[PDB]
Design an enzyme around this catalytic site. Structure first.
Site, PDB file in Angstrom:
ATOM      1  N   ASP A  10       0.926  -0.920  -0.159  1.00  0.00           N
ATOM      2  CA  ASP A  10      -0.363   0.000   0.360  1.00  0.00           C
ATOM      3  C   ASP A  10       0.689   1.446   0.514  1.00  0.00           C
ATOM      4  OD1 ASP A  10      -1.748   2.039   0.085  1.00  0.00           O
ATOM      5  OD2 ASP A  10      -3.156   0.903   1.489  1.00  0.00           O
TER       6      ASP A  10
ATOM      7  N   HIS B   7      -5.592  -0.878   1.269  1.00  0.00           N
ATOM      8  CA  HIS B   7      -5.730  -1.528   1.605  1.00  0.00           C
ATOM      9  C   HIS B   7      -7.303  -1.597   2.242  1.00  0.00           C
ATOM     10  CE1 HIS B   7      -3.558  -0.628   4.907  1.00  0.00           C
ATOM     11  NE2 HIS B   7      -3.682  -1.737   5.329  1.00  0.00           N
TER      12      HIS B   7
ATOM     13  N   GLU C 121     -11.311  -4.423  14.327  1.00  0.00           N
ATOM     14  CA  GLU C 121     -10.095  -5.083  14.161  1.00  0.00           C
ATOM     15  C   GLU C 121      -8.416  -3.553  14.664  1.00  0.00           C
ATOM     16  OE1 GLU C 121      -9.359  -8.543  12.417  1.00  0.00           O
ATOM     17  OE2 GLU C 121     -11.036  -9.365  13.330  1.00  0.00           O
TER      18      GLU C 121
ATOM     19  N   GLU D  98       1.163   1.986  12.712  1.00  0.00           N
ATOM     20  CA  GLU D  98       0.235   1.960  12.523  1.00  0.00           C
ATOM     21  C   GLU D  98      -0.848   0.879  12.815  1.00  0.00           C
ATOM     22  OE1 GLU D  98      -2.536   0.885  10.411  1.00  0.00           O
ATOM     23  OE2 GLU D  98      -1.242   0.045   8.427  1.00  0.00           O
TER      24      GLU D  98
END
Ligand SMILES: N=C(NCCCSC[C@H]1O[C@@H](n2cnc3c(N)ncnc32)[C@H](O)[C@@H]1O)Nc1ccccc1
Ligand SMILES: N=C(NCCCSC[C@H]1O[C@@H](n2cnc3c(N)ncnc32)[C@H](O)[C@@H]1O)Nc1ccccc1
Lengths: 302, 302
Positions: free
Chosen positions: B12, B255, B114, B105
């Site tokens: 990504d 993504h 999640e 991240e």
């Protein structure tokens, strides 16, 4: 239990129309027969069999999806023909000793990854009447040589320079993972070679572990970067209207796509060359040991 | 433990080049600082921080990937700057009391599915020095109205006629599942509405459960079939060179794609209309309760 896998399978037209075509175009196989659907999911194959004139269809699924099948069978008014039983086919109590026909969609990636064939074979050995039939009856597995330096570089070489940093140690984790993807048929650089023929009537569980020596007839002078695997599904026994479908890259794509084994060391091949290798499949799950160009790698499917 | 998620994240370019651009174009934030990388994975952000002049980088990951990070950091000769610690950030022993900068991240689908933000916030409350900084510092979540009868029919109406058989009972399993996919920006029929602003310096865990009343400014007379969610990521605090990226459908795909909540009952809207609704997010994991056009549905992310 989840519906996502059922939606993916149902939306595969090659898969679902092959089964439909087999059942509807050979109704003599089903007419007044007792049918067992191993791992029936939403019960679509059970309903095709009832439509083709089955006397009785037993749909067996171990997962939560069976509760949806119960509702689907009532919604189509087939509860007088189709009985649904929740549980492992290895454990459930059937209201019959024997069945005339077994149907199932048990096939995994590369045919045998996370496949249900073990359970279909248990159902065959325990429940099939003398002279009954199992469908689909015949399966093959094939290998074909691939040239795709760009895809190989995207997966492997990539790790050498990640935004200025070396991550080359990651490649040893990547190479052993088989990739499931649809191959551009332009990247195929050999004729296919068959490595396995299965007749579901006569194959045992032990037969599904196997070794094959193979010869790839090279059709393009190129860098061989990978070997691709796929499978063909046949409906033959007692059919007036035989059905076949291929999951190969020369055919309309299916949810099974193709299984791709990347070579650690791509190597040059010549048109006309007879490229010899050895492949071995082992279970527990599934691994694929490939020897080609004097090196060996074992692959698994994540 | 697995590398597949790490490859997806690393490939990504929007994600990874945003972080790179932030760190390299604001080196005053890192110069001779102690940096903590929460859930460091392959350690790329730890290496960017060392390159920008960090005195010390502590990379913490709970999974097997940390062993690959150890090798990657040695392969780039940064073991004198970057120390890697295996374990939950909530459990590990750090060789320092405090850190100057936290980077991570942590973002999931729709930002909070999640997500690791809980762990980043634990690291902030326990380890950030007085007057230190956490990056990225500012996040927003947005909704936008969608018209796509064909995609709605492919997902929902599909179940009414499956090769001649009713499976309408399946729709009640499908509707409550949010879809993660890239939206054709042509199917957007409103201006975006912001529903959540997070500053990581000041937000608590409890703030991440929230309710927002929203107004979608309709820009096309059409059948509204879905509401789409996405998020924007900001690097602001003490930056000379601010960085932002959007995961919205008007921007280069990431993504994270976009999160799509299908309406059970699509309804007609008019250009100029102020379409009012209510959204609420709850944890355990994540659910999204949507009220629009006088009906309510709770969605989860599979
Ligand atoms: N098309 C595929 N085809 C094979 C496997 C699908 S499982 C298909 C169905 O069979 C059920 N099942 C599995 N093992 C058993 C058992 N021992 N006894 C009773 N019921 C069983 C399972 O609950 C599921 O609903 N696989 C596939 C699908 C999507 C993506 C990749 C591969
Ligand atoms: N881009 C994403 N971004 C957020 C989540 C990635 S997990 C990123 C990394 O963090 C590690 N981790 C998670 N929780 C903790 C913990 N409490 N303490 C220490 N290490 C932790 C995990 O082992 C993994 O390597 N997610 C994503 C990625 C692919 C597809 C969809 C979403």
């Amino acid at each position: 239990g989840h519906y996502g896998i059922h939606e993916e399978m149902l939306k595969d037209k090659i898969r679902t129309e092959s089964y439909r075509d087999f059942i509807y175009q050979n109704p003599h196989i089903f007419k007044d027969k007792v049918v067992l659907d191993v791992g029936c999911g939403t019960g679509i194959l059970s309903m095709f069999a009832a439509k083709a004139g089955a006397k009785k269809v037993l749909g067996v699924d171990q997962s939560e999806i069976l509760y949806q099948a119960m509702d689907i069978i009532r919604l189509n008014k087939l509860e007088d023909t189709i009985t649904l039983i929740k549980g492992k086919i290895e454990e459930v109590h059937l209201p019959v000793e024997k069945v005339d026909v077994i149907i199932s969609e048990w096939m995994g990636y590369f045919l045998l990854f996370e496949s249900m064939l073990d359970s279909v074979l248990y159902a065959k050995n325990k429940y099939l009447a003398k002279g009954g039939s199992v469908y689909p009856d015949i399966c093959t597995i094939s290998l074909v040589a691939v040239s795709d330096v760009n895809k190989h570089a995207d997966r492997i070489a990539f790790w050498d320079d990640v935004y200025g940093f070396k991550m080359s140690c990651m490649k040893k984790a990547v190479i052993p993972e088989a990739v499931v993807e649809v191959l551009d048929p332009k990247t195929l650089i050999s004729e296919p070679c068959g490595i396995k023929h299965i007749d579901c009537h006569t194959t045992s569980i032990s037969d599904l572990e196997f070794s094959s020596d193979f010869t790839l007839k090279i059709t393009r002078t190129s860098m061989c970067t990978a070997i691709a695997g796929y499978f063909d599904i046949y409906f033959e026994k007692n059919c007036h209207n035989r059905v076949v479908f291929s999951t190969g890259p020369q055919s309309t794509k299916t949810h099974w796509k193709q299984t791709v084994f990347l070579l650690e060391k791509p190597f040059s091949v010549k048109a006309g060359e007879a490229l010899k290798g050895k492949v071995t499949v082992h279970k527990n799950s599934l691994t694929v040991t490939l020897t080609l160009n004097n090196s060996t790698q074992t692959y698994g499917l994540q």
